[PDB]
PDB file of C-alpha atoms and ligand atoms in Angstrom:
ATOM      1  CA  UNK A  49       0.000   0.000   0.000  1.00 53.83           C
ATOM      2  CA  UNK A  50       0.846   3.633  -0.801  1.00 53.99           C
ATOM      3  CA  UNK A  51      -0.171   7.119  -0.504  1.00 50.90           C
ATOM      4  CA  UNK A  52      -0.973   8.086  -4.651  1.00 50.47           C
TER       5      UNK A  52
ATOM      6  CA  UNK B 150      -6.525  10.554   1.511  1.00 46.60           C
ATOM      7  CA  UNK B 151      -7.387   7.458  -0.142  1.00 46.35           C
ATOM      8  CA  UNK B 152      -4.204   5.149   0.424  1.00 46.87           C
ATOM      9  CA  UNK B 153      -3.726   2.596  -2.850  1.00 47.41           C
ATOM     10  CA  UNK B 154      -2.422  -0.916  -3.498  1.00 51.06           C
ATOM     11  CA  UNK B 155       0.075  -1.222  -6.166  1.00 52.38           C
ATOM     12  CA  UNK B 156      -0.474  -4.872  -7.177  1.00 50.36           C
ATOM     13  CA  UNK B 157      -4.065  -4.625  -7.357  1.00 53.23           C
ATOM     14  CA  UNK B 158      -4.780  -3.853 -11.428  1.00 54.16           C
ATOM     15  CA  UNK B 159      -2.708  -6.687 -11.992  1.00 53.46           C
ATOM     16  CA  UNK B 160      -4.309  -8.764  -9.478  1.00 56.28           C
ATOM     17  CA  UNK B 161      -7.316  -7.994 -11.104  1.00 57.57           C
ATOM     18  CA  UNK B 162      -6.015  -8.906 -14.616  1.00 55.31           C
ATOM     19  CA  UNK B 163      -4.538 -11.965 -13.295  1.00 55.85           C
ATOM     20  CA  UNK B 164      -8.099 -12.873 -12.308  1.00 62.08           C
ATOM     21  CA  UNK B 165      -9.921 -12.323 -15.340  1.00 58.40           C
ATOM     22  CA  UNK B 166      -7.275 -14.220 -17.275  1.00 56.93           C
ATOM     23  CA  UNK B 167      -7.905 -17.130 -15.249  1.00 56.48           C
ATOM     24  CA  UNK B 168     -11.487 -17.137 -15.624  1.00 60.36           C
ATOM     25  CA  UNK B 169     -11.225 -16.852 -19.897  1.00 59.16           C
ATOM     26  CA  UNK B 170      -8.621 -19.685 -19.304  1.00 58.29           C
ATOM     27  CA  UNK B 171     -11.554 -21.868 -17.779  1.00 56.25           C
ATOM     28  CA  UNK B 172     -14.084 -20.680 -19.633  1.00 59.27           C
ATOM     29  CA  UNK B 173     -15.292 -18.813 -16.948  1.00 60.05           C
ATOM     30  CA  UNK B 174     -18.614 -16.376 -17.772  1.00 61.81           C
ATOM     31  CA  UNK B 175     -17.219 -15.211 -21.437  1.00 61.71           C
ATOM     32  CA  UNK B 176     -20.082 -14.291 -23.192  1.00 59.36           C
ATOM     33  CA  UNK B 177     -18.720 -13.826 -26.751  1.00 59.60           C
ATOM     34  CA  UNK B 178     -17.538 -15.524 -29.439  1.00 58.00           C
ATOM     35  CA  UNK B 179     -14.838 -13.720 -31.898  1.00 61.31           C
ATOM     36  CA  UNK B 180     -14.987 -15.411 -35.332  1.00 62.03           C
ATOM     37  CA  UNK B 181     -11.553 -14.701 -37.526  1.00 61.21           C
ATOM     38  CA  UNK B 182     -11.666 -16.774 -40.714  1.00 60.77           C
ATOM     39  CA  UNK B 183     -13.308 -19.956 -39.102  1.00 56.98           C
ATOM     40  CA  UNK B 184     -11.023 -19.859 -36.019  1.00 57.99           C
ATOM     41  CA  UNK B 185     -13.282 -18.800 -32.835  1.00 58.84           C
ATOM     42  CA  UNK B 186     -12.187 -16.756 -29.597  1.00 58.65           C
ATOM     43  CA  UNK B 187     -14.151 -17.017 -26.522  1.00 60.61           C
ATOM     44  CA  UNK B 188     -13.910 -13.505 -24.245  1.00 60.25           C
ATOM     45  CA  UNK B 189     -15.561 -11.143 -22.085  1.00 59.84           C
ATOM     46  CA  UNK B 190     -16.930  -8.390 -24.070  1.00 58.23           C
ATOM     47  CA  UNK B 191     -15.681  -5.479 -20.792  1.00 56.49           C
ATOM     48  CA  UNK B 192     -12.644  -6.694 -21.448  1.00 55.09           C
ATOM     49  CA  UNK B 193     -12.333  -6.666 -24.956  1.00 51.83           C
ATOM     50  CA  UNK B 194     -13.859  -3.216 -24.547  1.00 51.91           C
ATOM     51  CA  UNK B 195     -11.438  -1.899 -22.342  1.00 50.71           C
ATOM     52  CA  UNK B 196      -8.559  -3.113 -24.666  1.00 48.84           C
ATOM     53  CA  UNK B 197      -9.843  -1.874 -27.649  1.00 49.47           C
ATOM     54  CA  UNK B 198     -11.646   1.299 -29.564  1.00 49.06           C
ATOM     55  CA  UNK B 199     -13.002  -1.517 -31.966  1.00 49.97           C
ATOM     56  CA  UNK B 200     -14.496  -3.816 -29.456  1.00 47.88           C
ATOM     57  CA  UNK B 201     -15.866  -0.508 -26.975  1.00 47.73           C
ATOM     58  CA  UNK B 202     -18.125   1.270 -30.277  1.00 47.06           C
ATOM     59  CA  UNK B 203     -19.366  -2.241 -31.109  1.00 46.14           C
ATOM     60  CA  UNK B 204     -20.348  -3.111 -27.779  1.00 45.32           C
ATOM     61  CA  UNK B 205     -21.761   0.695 -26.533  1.00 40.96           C
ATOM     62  CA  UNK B 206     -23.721  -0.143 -29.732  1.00 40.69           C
ATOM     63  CA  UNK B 207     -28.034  -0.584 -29.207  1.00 40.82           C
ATOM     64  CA  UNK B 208     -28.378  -3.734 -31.327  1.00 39.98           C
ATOM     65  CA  UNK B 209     -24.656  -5.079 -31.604  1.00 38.41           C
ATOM     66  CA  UNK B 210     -24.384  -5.313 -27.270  1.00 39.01           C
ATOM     67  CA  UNK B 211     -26.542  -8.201 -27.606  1.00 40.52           C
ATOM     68  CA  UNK B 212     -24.542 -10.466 -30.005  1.00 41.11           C
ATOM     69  CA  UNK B 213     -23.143 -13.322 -28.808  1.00 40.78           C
ATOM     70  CA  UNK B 214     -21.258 -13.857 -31.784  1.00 38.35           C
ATOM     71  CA  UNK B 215     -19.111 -11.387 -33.701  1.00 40.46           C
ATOM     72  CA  UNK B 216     -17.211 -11.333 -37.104  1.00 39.63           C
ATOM     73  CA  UNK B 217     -14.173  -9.792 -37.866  1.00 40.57           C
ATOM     74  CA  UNK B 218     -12.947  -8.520 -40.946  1.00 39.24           C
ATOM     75  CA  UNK B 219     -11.551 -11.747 -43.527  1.00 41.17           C
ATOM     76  CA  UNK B 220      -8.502  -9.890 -43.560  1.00 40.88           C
ATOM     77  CA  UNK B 221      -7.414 -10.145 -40.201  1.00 39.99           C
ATOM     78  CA  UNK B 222      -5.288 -13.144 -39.404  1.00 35.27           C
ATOM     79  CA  UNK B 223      -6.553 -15.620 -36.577  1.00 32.85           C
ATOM     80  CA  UNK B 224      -2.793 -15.436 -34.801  1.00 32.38           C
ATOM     81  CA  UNK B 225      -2.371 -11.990 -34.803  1.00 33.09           C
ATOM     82  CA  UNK B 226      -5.815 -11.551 -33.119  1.00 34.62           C
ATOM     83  CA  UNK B 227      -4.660 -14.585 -30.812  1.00 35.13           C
ATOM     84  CA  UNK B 228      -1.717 -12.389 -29.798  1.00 34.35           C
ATOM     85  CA  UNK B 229      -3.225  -9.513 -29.255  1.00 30.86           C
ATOM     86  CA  UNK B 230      -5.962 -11.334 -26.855  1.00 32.94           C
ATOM     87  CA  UNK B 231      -3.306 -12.716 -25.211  1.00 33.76           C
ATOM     88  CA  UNK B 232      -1.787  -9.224 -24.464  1.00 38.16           C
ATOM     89  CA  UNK B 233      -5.123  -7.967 -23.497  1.00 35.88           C
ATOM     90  CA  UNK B 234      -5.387 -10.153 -20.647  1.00 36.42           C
ATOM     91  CA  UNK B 235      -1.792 -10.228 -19.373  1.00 35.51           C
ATOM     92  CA  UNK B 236      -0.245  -7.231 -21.129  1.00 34.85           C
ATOM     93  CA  UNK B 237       2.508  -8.832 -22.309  1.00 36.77           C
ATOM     94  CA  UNK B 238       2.598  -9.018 -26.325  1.00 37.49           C
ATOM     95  CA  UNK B 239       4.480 -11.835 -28.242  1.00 36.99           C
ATOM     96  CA  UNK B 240       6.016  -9.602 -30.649  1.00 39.00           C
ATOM     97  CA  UNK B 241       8.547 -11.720 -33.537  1.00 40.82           C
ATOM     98  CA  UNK B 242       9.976 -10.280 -36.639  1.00 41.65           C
ATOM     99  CA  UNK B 243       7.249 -13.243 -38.580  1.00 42.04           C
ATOM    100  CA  UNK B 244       4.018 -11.907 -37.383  1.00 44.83           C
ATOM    101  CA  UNK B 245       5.074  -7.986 -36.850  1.00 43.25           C
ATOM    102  CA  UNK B 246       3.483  -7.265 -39.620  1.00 40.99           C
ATOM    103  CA  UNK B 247       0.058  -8.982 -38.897  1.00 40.31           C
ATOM    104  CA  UNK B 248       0.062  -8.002 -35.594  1.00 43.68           C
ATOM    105  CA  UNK B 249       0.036  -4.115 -36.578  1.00 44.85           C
ATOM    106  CA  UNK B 250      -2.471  -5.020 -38.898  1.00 44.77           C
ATOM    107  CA  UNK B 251      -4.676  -6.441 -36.225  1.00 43.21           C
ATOM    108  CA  UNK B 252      -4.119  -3.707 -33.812  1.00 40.34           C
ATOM    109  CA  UNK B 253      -4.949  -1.012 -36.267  1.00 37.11           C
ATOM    110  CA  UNK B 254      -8.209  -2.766 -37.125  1.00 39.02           C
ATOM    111  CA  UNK B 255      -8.904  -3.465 -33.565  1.00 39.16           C
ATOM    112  CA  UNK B 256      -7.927   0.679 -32.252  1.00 38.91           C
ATOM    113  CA  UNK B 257      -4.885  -0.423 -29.696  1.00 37.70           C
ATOM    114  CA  UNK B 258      -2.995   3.067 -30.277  1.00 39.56           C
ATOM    115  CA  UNK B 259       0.167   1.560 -27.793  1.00 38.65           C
ATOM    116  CA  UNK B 260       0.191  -1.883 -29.310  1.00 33.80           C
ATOM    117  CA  UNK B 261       0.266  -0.047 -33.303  1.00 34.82           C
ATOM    118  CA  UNK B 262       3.158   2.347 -31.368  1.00 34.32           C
ATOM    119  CA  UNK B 263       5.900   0.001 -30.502  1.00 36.00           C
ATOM    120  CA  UNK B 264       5.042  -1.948 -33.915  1.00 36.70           C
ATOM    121  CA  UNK B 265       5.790   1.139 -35.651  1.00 33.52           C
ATOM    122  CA  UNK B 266       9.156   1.667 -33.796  1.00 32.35           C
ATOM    123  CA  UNK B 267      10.159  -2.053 -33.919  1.00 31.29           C
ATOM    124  CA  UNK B 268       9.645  -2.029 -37.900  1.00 30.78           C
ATOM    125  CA  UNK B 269      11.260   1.296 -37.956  1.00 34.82           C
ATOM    126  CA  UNK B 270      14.603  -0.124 -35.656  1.00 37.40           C
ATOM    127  CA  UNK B 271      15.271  -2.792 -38.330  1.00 34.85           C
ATOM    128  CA  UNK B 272      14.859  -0.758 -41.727  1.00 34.69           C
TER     129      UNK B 272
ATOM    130  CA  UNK C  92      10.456 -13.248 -25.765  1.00 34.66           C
ATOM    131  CA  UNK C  93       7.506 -11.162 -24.971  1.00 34.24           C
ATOM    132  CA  UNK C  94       7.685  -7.754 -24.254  1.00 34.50           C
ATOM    133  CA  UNK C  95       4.940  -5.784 -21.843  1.00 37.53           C
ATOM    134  CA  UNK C  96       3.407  -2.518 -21.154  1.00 37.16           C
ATOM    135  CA  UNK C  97       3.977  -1.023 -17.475  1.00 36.94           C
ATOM    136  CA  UNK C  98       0.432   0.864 -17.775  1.00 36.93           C
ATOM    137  CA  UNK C  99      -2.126  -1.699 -19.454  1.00 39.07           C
ATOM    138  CA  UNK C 100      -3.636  -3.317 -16.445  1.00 40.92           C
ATOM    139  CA  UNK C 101      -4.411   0.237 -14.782  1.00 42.76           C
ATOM    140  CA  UNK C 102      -5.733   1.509 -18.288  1.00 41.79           C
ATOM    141  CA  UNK C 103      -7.879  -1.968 -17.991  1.00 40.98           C
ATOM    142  CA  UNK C 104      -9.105  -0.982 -14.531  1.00 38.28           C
ATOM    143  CA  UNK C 105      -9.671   2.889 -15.416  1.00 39.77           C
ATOM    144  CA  UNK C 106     -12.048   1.514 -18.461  1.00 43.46           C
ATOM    145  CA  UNK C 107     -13.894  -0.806 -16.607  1.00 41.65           C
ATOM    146  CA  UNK C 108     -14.753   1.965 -14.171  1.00 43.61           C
ATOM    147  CA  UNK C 109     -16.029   4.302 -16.806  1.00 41.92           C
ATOM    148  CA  UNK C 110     -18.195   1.245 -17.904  1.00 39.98           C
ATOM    149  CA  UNK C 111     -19.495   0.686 -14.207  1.00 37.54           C
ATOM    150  CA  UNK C 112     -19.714   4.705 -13.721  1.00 43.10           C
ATOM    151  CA  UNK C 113     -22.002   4.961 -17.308  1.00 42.26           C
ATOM    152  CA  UNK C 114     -24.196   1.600 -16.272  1.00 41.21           C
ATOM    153  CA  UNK C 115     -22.383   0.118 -19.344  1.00 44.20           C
ATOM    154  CA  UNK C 116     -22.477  -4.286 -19.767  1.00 40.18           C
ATOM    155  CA  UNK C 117     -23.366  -4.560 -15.933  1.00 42.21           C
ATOM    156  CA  UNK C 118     -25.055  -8.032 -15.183  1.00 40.43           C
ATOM    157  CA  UNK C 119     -25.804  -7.772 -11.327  1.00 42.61           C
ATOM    158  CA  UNK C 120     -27.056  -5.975  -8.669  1.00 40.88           C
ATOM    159  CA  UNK C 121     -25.763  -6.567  -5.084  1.00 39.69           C
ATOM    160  CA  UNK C 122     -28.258  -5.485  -2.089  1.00 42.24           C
ATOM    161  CA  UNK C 123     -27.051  -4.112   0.731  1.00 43.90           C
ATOM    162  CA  UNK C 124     -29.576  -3.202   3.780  1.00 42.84           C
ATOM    163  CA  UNK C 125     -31.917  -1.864   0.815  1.00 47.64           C
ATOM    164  CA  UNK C 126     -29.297  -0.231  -0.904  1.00 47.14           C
ATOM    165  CA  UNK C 127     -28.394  -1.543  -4.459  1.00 48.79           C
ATOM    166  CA  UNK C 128     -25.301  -1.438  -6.522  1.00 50.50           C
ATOM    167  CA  UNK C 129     -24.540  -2.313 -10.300  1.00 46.10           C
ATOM    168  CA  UNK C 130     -21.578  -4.164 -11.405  1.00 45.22           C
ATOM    169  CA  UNK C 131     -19.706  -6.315 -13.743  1.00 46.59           C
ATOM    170  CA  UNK C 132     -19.659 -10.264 -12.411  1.00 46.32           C
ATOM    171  CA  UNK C 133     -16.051 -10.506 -13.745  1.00 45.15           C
ATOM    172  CA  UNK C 134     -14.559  -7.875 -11.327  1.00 48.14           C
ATOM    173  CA  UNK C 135     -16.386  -8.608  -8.500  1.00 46.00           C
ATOM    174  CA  UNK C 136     -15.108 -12.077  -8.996  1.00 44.07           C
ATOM    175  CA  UNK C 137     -11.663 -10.999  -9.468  1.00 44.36           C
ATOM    176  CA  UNK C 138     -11.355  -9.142  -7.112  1.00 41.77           C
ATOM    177  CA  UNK C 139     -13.377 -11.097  -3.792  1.00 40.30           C
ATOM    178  CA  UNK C 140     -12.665 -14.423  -2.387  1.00 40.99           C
ATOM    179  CA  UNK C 141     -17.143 -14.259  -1.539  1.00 38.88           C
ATOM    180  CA  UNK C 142     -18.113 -13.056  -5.363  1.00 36.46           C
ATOM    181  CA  UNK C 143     -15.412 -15.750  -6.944  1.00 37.24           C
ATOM    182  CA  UNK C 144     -17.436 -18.949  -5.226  1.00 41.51           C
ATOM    183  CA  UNK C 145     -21.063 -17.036  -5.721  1.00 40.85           C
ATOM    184  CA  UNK C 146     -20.972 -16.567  -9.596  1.00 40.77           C
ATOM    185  CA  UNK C 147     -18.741 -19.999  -9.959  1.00 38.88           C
ATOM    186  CA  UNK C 148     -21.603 -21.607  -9.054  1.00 38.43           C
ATOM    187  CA  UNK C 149     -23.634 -23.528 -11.279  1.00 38.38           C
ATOM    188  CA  UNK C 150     -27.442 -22.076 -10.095  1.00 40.99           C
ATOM    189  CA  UNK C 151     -25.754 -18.697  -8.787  1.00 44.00           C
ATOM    190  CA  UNK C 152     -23.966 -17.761 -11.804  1.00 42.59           C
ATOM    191  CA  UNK C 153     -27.133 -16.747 -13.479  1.00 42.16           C
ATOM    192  CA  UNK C 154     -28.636 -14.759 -10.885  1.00 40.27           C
ATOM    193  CA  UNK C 155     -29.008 -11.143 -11.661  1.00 44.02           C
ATOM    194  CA  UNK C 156     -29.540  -9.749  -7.731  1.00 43.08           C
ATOM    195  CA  UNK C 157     -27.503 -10.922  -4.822  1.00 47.95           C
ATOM    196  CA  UNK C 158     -28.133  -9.913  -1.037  1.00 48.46           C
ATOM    197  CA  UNK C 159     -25.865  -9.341   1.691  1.00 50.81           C
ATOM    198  CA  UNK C 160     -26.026 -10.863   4.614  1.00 52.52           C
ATOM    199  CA  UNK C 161     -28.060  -8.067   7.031  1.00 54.08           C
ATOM    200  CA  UNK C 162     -24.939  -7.054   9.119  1.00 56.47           C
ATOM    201  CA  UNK C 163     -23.270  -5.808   6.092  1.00 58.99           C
ATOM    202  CA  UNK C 164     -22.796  -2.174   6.406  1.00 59.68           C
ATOM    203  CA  UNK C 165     -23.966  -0.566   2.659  1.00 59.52           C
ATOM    204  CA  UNK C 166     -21.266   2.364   3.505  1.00 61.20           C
ATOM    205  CA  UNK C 167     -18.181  -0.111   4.111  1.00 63.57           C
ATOM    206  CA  UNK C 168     -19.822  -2.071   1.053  1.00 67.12           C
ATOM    207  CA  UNK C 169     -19.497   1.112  -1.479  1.00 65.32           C
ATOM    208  CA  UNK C 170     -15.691   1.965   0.080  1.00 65.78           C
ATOM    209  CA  UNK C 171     -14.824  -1.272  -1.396  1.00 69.97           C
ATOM    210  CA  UNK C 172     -16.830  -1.732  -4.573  1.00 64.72           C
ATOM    211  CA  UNK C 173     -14.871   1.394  -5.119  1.00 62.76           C
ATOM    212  CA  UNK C 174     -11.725   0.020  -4.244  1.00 62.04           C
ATOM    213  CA  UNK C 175     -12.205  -2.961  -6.714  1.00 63.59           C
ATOM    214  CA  UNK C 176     -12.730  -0.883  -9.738  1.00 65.14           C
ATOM    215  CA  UNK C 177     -10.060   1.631  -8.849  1.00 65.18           C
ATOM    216  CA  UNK C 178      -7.143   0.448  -6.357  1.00 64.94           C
ATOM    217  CA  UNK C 179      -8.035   3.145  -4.048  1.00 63.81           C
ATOM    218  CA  UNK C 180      -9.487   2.347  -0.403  1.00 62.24           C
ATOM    219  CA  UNK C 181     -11.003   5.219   1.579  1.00 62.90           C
ATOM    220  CA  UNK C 182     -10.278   3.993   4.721  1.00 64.39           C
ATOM    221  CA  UNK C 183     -11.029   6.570   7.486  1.00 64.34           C
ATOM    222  CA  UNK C 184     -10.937   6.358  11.333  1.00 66.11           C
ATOM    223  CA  UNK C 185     -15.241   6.595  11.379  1.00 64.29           C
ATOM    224  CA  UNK C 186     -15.013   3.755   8.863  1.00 64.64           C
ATOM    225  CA  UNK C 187     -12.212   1.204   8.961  1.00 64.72           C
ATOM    226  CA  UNK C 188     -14.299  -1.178  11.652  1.00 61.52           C
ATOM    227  CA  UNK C 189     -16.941  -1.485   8.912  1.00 66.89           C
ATOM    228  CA  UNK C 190     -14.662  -1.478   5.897  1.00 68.43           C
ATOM    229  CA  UNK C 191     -12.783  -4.350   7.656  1.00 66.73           C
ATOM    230  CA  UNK C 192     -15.934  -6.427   8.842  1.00 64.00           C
ATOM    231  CA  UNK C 193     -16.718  -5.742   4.862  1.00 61.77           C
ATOM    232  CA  UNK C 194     -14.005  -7.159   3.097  1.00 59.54           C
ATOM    233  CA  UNK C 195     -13.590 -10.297   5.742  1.00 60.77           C
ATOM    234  CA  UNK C 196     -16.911 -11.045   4.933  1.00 59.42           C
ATOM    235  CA  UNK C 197     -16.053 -10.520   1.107  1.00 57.87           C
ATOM    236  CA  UNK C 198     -12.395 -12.562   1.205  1.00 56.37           C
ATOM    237  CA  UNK C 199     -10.518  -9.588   0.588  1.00 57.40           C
ATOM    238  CA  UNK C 200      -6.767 -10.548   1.892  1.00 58.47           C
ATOM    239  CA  UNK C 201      -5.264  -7.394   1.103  1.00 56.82           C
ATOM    240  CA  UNK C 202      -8.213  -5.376   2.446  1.00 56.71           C
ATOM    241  CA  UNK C 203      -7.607  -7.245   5.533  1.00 55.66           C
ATOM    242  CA  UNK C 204      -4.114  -6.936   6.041  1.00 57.12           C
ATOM    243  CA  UNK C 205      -4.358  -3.203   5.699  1.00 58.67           C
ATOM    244  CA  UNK C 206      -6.877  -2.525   8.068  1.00 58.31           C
ATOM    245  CA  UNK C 207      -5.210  -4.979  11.022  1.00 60.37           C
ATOM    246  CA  UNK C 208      -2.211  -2.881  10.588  1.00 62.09           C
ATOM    247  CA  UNK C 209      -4.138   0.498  10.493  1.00 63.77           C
ATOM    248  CA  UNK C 210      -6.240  -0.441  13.876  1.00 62.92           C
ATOM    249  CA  UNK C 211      -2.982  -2.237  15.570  1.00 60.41           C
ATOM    250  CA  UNK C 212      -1.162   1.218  15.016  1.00 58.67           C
ATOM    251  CA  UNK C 213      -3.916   3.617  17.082  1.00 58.22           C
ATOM    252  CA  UNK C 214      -3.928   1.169  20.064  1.00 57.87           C
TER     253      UNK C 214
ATOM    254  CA  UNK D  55       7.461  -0.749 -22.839  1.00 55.95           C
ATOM    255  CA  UNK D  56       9.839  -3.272 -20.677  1.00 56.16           C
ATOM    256  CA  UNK D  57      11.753  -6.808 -20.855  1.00 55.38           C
ATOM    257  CA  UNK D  58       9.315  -8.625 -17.900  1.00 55.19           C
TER     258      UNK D  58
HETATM  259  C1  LIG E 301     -12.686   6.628 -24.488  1.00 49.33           C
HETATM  260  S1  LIG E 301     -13.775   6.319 -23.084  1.00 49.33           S
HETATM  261  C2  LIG E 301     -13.799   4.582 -22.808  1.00 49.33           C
HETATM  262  N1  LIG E 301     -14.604   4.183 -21.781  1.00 49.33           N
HETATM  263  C3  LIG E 301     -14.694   2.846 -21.582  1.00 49.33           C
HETATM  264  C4  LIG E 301     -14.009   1.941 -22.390  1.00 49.33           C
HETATM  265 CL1  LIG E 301     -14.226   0.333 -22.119  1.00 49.33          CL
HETATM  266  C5  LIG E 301     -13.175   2.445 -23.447  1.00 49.33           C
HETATM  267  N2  LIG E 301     -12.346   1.655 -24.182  1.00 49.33           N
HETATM  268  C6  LIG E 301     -11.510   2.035 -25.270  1.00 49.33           C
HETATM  269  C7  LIG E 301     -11.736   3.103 -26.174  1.00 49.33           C
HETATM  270  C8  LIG E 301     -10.775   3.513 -27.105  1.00 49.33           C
HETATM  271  C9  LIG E 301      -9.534   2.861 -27.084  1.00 49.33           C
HETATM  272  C10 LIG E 301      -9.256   1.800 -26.161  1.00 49.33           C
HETATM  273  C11 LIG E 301     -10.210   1.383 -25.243  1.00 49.33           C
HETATM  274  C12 LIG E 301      -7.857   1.304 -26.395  1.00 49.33           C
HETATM  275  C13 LIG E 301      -7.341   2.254 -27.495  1.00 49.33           C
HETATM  276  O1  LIG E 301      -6.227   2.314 -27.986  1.00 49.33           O
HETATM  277  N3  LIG E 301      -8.389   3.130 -27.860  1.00 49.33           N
HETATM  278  N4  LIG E 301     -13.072   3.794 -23.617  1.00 49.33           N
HETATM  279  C1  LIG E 302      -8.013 -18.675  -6.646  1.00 50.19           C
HETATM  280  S1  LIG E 302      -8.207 -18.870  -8.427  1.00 50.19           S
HETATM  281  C2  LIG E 302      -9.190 -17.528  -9.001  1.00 50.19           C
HETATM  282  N1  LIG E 302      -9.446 -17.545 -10.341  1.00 50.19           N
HETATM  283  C3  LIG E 302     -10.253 -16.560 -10.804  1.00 50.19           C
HETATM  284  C4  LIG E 302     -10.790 -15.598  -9.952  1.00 50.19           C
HETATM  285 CL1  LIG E 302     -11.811 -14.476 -10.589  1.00 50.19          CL
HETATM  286  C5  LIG E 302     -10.464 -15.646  -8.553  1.00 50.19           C
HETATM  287  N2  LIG E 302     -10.806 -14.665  -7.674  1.00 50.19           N
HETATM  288  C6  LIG E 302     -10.571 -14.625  -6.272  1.00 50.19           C
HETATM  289  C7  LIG E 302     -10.463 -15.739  -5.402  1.00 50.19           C
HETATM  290  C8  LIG E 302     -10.058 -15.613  -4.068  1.00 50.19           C
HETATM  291  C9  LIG E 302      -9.702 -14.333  -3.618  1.00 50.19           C
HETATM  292  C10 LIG E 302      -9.764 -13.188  -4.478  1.00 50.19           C
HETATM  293  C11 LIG E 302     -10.176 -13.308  -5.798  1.00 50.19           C
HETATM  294  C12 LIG E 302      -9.334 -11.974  -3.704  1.00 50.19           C
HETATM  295  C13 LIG E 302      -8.941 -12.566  -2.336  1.00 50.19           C
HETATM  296  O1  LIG E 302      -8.454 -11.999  -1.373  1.00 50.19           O
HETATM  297  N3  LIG E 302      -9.200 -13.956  -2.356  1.00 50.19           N
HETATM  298  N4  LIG E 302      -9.628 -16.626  -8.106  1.00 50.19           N
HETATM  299 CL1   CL E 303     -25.632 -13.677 -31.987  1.00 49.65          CL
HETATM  300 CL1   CL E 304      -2.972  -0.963 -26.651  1.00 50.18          CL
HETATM  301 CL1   CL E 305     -32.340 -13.003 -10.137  1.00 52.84          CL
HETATM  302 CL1   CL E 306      -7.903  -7.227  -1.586  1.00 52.45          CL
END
């Protein structure tokens, strides 16, 4: 997971 | 502030090639000169500018059988199925040529891109 | 030998939510507590564990509404309907109990993992 | 475009  | 998972579009694709691999709720048929190609029409929609007018279209939407052109050649369509459920494309100097062919026909502007510079690299 | 394109399965993903956004080739409705949403069988089985075994079934495959069990929240439901056709989850401190109870319920790992690690953090 |  990741911040876009 | 939506957080997102990288893998996930894959994933997804993954999926969906696993279900055309078994059959799995295809509800088309792709006829190229006798040969036939079972698919899911979203798919082939999202893939292709051919495949998204034909099925956005009233009476066409409902077909559970479609015809391509004679022209097109049953393994360059193959190929380019293939590539629209994994995204990778089995691109050789002997079917090049087809395979542009069949991506032009089918409106797959990146696919008719790297064809172009591939036949351009060895001229 | 093949080669493959970085961005296809996203530009998949981003068409099949412009289908799903327009009402475009969707073949189910799934009720929530009253509330209904439209989708495409093929990404809801691709993307939940729950959907996968429903429409793999030989009398449930053909069913064109599906209800939730009662408990199911429709809120935590539409965070991850979202997150299927898109790769981004909304999760939120007034909603990550019911986005997690969600996406047990739907057999969504990654969902899962994500929220354990989110909640496990604030205590 | 990449080698996979
Ligand atoms: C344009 S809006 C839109 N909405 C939904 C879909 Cl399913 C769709 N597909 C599509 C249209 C055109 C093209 C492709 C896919 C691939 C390509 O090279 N050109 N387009
Ligand atoms: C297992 S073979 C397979 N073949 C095709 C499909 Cl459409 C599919 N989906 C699916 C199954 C289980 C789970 C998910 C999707 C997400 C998750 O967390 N668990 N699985
Ligand atoms: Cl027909
Ligand atoms: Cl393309
Ligand atoms: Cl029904
Ligand atoms: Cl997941």
């Amino acid at each position: 997971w990741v911040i876009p | 502030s939506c957080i997102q998972f990288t893998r996930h579009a894959s994933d997804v694709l993954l999926n969906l090639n696993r279900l055309r691999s078994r059959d799995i709720l295809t509800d088309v048929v792709i006829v190229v000169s006798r040969e036939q190609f079972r698919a899911h029409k979203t798919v082939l929609m999202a893939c292709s500018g051919l495949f998204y007018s034909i099925f956005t279209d009233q009476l066409k939407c409902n077909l559970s059988v479609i015809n391509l052109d004679p022209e097109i050649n049953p393994e360059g369509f193959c190929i380019l199925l293939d590539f629209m459920y994994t995204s990778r494309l089995n691109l050789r100097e002997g079917n090049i040529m087809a395979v542009m062919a069949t991506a032009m026909y089918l409106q797959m502007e990146h696919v008719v891109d790297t064809c172009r510079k591939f036949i351009k690299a060895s001229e």
